[PDB]
Design a protein around this ligand. Structure first.
Ligand SMILES: [Mg+2]
Ligand SMILES: [Mg+2]
Ligand SMILES: [Mg+2]
Ligand SMILES: [Mg+2]
Ligand SMILES: [Mg+2]
Ligand SMILES: [Mg+2]
Ligand SMILES: [Mg+2]
Ligand SMILES: [Mg+2]
Ligand SMILES: [Mg+2]
Lengths: 51, 150, 117
RNA sequence: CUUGAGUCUCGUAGAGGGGGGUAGAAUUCCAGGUGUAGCGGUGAAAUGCGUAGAGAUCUGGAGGAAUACCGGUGGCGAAGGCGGCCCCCUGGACGAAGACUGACGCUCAGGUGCGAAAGCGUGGGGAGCAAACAGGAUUAGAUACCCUGGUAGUCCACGCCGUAAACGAUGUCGACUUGGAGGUUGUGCCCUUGAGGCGUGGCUUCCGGAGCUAACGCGUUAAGUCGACCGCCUGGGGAGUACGGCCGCAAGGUUAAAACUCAAAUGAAUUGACGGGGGCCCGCACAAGCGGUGGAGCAUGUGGUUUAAUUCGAUGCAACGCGA
């Protein structure tokens, strides 16, 4: 992640790489691994990944 | 609940003309004796005259400005805990809040007659002092000290 | 004092707290702000509106050195990962390279279980 | 004899396996600078760590384990199970033309081999996580859930144990019976003249048709219709326990009863009910206000108590100035 873009202002843009990490890739971890719990949910979400 | 209303206004000032002022006469009015309310909310300004001087009209609102809040908190339960999320009160209830807290202390003066027990607080605001004005900033305490919320 | 003008200021946003440490240019402390020691803590701290006050509090405890333009380094999903930044773009501080460092192991360690509330 | 099955040729994809190296991110630790009164944690806290200078921030070093993104209803394997990269050794699968073999096949009690995780023996290894254990907290109690720590183990080499909801809870092989969309991987072909258009195979998801089914559902990868062989079931509790045999260092595994007792135990589905399940929506339910009760004295009813009787009925809201 990098930021420079000149032009005087301070709108935001803190959403660029944002949607590629954030407290998401973090929340993805931090707590005990899933081991088997993923093979189920990660493959159970597909049930919805269709309709 | 699922319906909405407007407001319940009434006959304004008997002569000085002032709708909201009526509230000060109603809110203070007890046992439904408005006939006597006008005897206190009116005679009050007739005493602050020499006290302050300038039109009793302004006199009221003047010190009243140092009694009306502008930010309060409302208990909101979440996941078991009930935060005290703050919230800036609009003018509508703002002016009201003051009058309530104002008339209250006035009746807690514990002296003799209310006519005076009312003027005291009516002026105590500007000069700053009393139970009424107390609440004003007293509410500010809880306020911001919870800004971590809203 | 030394006069750097060009320094950094990493933001450590932990789910429970956050500390703003304005470092020099080569990585040297110059003043650290902490959300906890901000006159408030517990459920009051952590929050952005609060945990941020610490960040901007650096000024009256860091600017004593004299700084103008500077970049920023964010590391931590804490409830202030952003809020803290705004205080910098309002306290007079300029702004430059804003990059996120927040670590992420390529699957190496093993986080603790727990959390059975 | 050749269609079953098998060999040859050429290619095709893949986390298949064993071994040997190697890479980058991150935690922990140790060291040094900067810098200072907090960090960490939680619902809050406290234990714990800080002025002997932590945390953060930066620089150097050590080590172990795991391989983010890719990555997927994706792939490979008998199953268990198998992910960075590279090399070496090596198993299976699949498609293309033919060539060769010529029923050489299917299944399989016993027998043999492989076996997640935990565990066991010997020697190594040890960063992170964590049985045990020790504090802190919660509670009426809390030998728990939560926090702070933390040993075995988790890692490696060799040997052992052989279990699992070892699950598709569905033995293997073969033959057939509408179709629809997608995945993945070979191969033929079409201005290839496009991404693409049309074929034909291997494996694979979701749907569903006849049929099957107690129903739920299965439905060409069947639970459909047939055949070959094998394993197993015969009411629930007692009990996968006891005794014995066999296996194991052990923990225990395997085979496996009876007495006594019950009239059931049980599967699917239906209606309602309920939930510290979800969605939605109302009522002075709450929220927003005002005024009350419990305080005091007295009135009235009641329970209790008392009395020769204190007539009887009324009892959560929905009894208690109620029948009166
Ligand atoms: Mg623990
Ligand atoms: Mg397969
Ligand atoms: Mg093991
Ligand atoms: Mg061992
Ligand atoms: Mg179907
Ligand atoms: Mg049932
Ligand atoms: Mg109503
Ligand atoms: Mg209320
Ligand atoms: Mg009250």
């Amino acid at each position: 992640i990098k930021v420079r873009e000149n032009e005087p202002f301070d709108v935001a843009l803190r959403r660029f790489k944002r949607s590629c990490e954030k407290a998401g890739v973090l929340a993805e971890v931090r707590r005990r691994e899933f081991y088997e719990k993923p093979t189920t949910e990660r493959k159970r979400a597909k049930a919805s990944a269709v309709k | 609940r699922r319906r909405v209303i407007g407001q319940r206004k009434i006959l304004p000032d008997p002569k000085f003309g002032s709708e909201l002022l009526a509230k000060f006469v109603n809110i203070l009015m007890v046992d439904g004796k408005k006939s006597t309310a006008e005897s206190i909310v009116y005679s009050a300004l007739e005493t602050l005259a020499q006290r302050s001087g300038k039109s009793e009209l302004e006199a009221f609102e003047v010190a009243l400005e140092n009694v009306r809040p502008t930010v309060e908190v409302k208990s909101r339960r979440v996941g078991g805990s009930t935060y005290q999320v703050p919230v800036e009160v609009r003018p509508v209830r703002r002016n009201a809040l003051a009058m309530r807290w104002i008339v209250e202390a006035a009746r807690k003066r514990g002296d003799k007659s209310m006519a005076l027990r009312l003027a005291n607080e009516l002026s105590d605001a500007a000069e700053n002092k009393g139970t009424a004005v107390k609440k004003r900033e007293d509410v500010h305490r809880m306020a911001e000290a919870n800004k971590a919320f809203a | 004092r030394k006069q750097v003008s060009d320094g950094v200021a990493h933001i450590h946003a932990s789910f429970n707290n956050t500390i703003v440490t304005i470092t020099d240019r080569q990585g040297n402390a110059l003043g650290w702000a902490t959300a906890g020691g901000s006159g408030f803590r517990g459920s009051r701290k952590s929050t952005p509106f609060a945990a941020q006050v610490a960040a901007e509090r650096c000024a009256d405890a860091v600017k004593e050195y004299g700084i103008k333009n500077l970049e920023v380094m964010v590391k931590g999903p804490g409830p202030g990962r952003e809020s803290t930044i705004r205080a910098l773009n309002a306290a007079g501080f300029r702004i430059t390279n804003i990059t996120d460092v927040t670590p992420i192991p390529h699957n190496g360690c093993r986080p603790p279980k727990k959390r059975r509330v």
